[PDB]
Design a protein around this ligand. Structure first.
Ligand SMILES: O=c1ccn([C@@H]2O[C@H](COP(=O)(O)OP(=O)(O)OP(=O)(O)O)[C@@H](O)[C@H]2O)c(=O)[nH]1
Ligand code: NA
Length: 461
């Protein structure tokens, strides 16, 4: 990923974009009842907490484009992955505007809470308008697709969320590159069934985990993996992607019946962005707020791991590479041990910065005891060991519960945390509930007891 040029949006006929300057995150009723060290992320250059320029920091994620062409290894990776996806009979048909907007089996309806994007954000019009849950009115939308047409600019927003102190002092705030409602609808029509196929098949055939339900899926993973597990973290995955990785992605799409509309991939790759008063053009880099970002990032991860393996171990048998990705997160396996540190080295050559799994200091062996996927561990249940517990650390839950963005959603926010929390065991869960109930707001909440959660879990399989 690399910014080719940036300049004043007025110079090119674009309206300044208004983004709230104040966070919506305030201490919650549980702020002092639990521990935590995270604060809201910097949303402006004027934040007293800053210890370096904001703009330089938020955009430093674009480390550049390391590779230019798709080499021999990448091409092989493409053939293999595309070969696997082939076995899913993915329906190559387009998706009718109705299903793309209000969803169908395998695909959820569009989310009304996220930015409608340009030009709407600058016109003040929102999603509530165009979309009618019970109506299913294509008309208004359909009309808009002719008036403004696809392939429109991406509105860049600073993600309003909790970050470590360092990420606050270093302006390391994440940005949200939002796509126009028009594009989201288009792509969902173009790829709609690809998404559904992926959502309906989390595992090692799609090599994807998007759309999965951790409570059920965790018990299926161990069986799918090969003997030896390997993993690693990516630093700035999305922004590090070079155009070549997008071409490889198009080759996969073409090979499975979507060559028809691989142009859509070109806009993710070479893209136009609006941020505040400035406008910029980026070469490479997966935008964080487009339709499919998650799935396309996972597909690219499947090509990356394959590529690094072929480049480092001539003779490797990709048929026994069992991996599952969720964007940049990944959990992989092979019948034989491999040198992650070595693989990370080849990774640099492809423009990927890979480091020991879970901020380790060195690349150590990956086990079912220390491996994490989506910040969650895998823990077999005491009573019935064949059922696996996705275990989110309590630290994560503690940090989250200490803040709020809307007191109206306190019931839902805490309930959600409870559904992640109990997998840590009855003792821990009850200590968690106790503290929640040690202040008025908590005592008024309708929270599930351990037993109720555990019994429900057992019956869900
Ligand atoms: O809206 C956004 C923007 C960015 N991101 C994602 O955040 C990642 C970079 O944002 P982080 O600051 O969390 O990235 P990191 O993974 O590079 O941090 P390290 O562990 O290496 O210290 C990028 O790889 C992108 O995918 C989102 O998930 N959503
Ligand atoms: Na891009």
């Amino acid at each position: 990923g690399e910014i080719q040029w940036m300049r004043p949006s007025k110079e090119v006929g674009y309206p300044i974009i208004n983004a709230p300057s104040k966070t919506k995150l305030e201490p919650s009723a549980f702020h002092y009842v639990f521990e935590g060290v995270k604060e809201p992320a910097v949303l402006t250059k004027n934040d007293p907490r800053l210890k370096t320029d904001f703009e330089e920091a938020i955009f430093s994620k674009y480390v550049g484009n390391k590779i230019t062409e798709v080499d021999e290894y990448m091409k092989e990776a493409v053939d293999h992955y595309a070969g696997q996806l082939m076995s899913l009979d993915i329906n190559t048909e387009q998706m009718c505007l109705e299903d793309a907007m209000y969803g169908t089996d395998g695909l959820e309806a569009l989310d009304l809470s996220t930015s409608a994007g340009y030009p709407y954000v600058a016109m003040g019009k929102k999603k509530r308008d165009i979309l009618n849950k019970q109506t299913r009115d294509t008309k208004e939308m359909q009309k808009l697709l002719d008036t403004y047409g696809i392939n429109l600019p991406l509105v860049t927003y600073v993600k309003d969320e909790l970050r470590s102190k360092t990420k606050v002092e270093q302006g390391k705030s994440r940005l949200i590159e939002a796509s126009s409602l028009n594009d989201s609808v288009a792509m969902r029509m173009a790829f709609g069934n690809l998404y559904a196929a992926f959502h309906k098949n989390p595992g090692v055939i799609t090599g994807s985990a998007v759309g999965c339900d951790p409570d059920l899926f965790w018990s299926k993973i161990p069986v799918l993996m090969e003997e030896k597990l390997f993993a690693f973290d990516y630093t700035g995955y999305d922004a590090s992607l070079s155009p070549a990785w997008f071409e490889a992605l198009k080759m996969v799409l073409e090979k499975i019946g979507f060559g028809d509309r691989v142009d859509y991939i070109d806009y993710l790759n070479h893209s136009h962005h609006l941020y505040k008063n400035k406008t910029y053009c980026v070469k490479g880099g997966m935008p964080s707020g487009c339709s499919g970002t998650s799935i396309f990032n996972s597909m690219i991860n499947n090509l990356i791991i394959r590529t690094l393996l072929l480049k480092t171990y001539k003779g490797i048998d990709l048929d026994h590479l069992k991996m599952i990705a969720y964007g940049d997160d990944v959990i992989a396996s092979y019948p034989h041990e491999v040198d992650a540190s070595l693989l990370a080295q080849s990774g640099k050559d492809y423009g990927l910065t890979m480091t020991p799994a879970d901020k380790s200091a060195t690349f150590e062996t990956v086990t079912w005891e220390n491996v994490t996927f989506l910040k969650r561990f895998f823990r077999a249940d005491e009573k019935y060991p064949f059922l696996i517990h996705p275990v989110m650390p309590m630290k994560e839950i503690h940090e989250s519960i200490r803040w709020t963005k809307d007191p109206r959603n306190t019931q839902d926010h805490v309930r959600s945390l409870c559904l992640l929390a109990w997998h840590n065991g009855e003792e821990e869960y009850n200590k968690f509930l106790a503290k929640i109930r040690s202040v008025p707001i908590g005592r008024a909440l309708d929270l599930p007891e351990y037993s109720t959660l555990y019994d429900r879990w057992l019956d869900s399989f």
